[PDB]
From a paper:
The Pat1 protein is involved in different aspects of mRNA decapping activation. Hence, Pat1 is considered as a central platform protein for decapping. Indeed, the crystal structure of the S. cerevisiae Pat1C shows that this domain structurally belongs to the ARM repeat superfamily, which mostly encompasses proteins involved in protein-protein interaction. In conclusion, the crystal structure of the ScPat1 C-terminal domain has revealed two functionally important regions localized at opposite extremities of the domain.
Residue numbers in the entry: 476 to 798
Write the structure that this text describes.
Amino acid sequence: KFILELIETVYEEILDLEANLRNGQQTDSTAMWEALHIDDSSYDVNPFISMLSFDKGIKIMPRIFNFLDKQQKLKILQKIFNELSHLQIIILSSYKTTPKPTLTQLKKVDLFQMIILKIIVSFLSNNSNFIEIMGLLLQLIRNNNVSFLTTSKIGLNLITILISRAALIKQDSSRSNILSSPEISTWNEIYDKLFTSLESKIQLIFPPREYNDHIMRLQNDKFMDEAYIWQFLASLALSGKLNHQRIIIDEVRDEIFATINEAETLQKKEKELSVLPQRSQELDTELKSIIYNKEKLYQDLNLFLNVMGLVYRDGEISELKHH
Ligand SMILES: [Cl-]
Ligand SMILES: [Mg+2]
């Protein structure tokens, strides 16, 4: 393709950069940047966006990013948030639009998650200010079916990364009154724009059990791993007013009780395994696995419950006591 040639020239441009890095020369990504075709609108679909559809394109991204400055990194993120709704890996990771992913589609989703989102997190955590997060957030909000996005694992995680970083800086800055009025106001405007794009569709962040089942079989284990769903719920809740929080917890209340029920079932299985005398190692690894799964369900729900000042503990939801 025209995209494989681009990947080879980008790669060569990388090796060049590395030699100059290694030989103590100043680094210049100008040619690497050009080779990505980030501003190129000649084609139906941008060639850098197209490059993200290839495992190889994905796998060289950390080395590309090693040579970019912050302005270049930001520009790349901006490009990604504009094309999000029709970005392949989003379509691939939505249960709506890809209700039965194959193993290789899954591994692709994981690869993108493992590599691209890791880079995005490092970048935003080491190089970002409130206004840049706001802009990325507005941009996502303006240019996508945000709810559709939330049905995607990558899409949701991208929202959570942005939203938790914003909350974090606002928290670190609040301790000494850094952050202007126009910024706190804009965040509450932007937050409320995000919120209202999700209102009444929040539960659609949880995929159908059927879909969960299909995925469990492909990966060979009994494992809802939905931490990323609860992490999103926690961050969404953390930045809302009481009104926002009551709406949220009301909309996901069936999922809260299904998770509690899931946890209670594992707790019962744990008890009946625990009373058995002189177990074999295989029985004991069965027991350790049930315990771990039980604890993960606790910890994942409690992530969200804690933000509402609640805690699930021993079959009960009670008021979280910090003191
Ligand atoms: Cl630039
Ligand atoms: Mg309302």
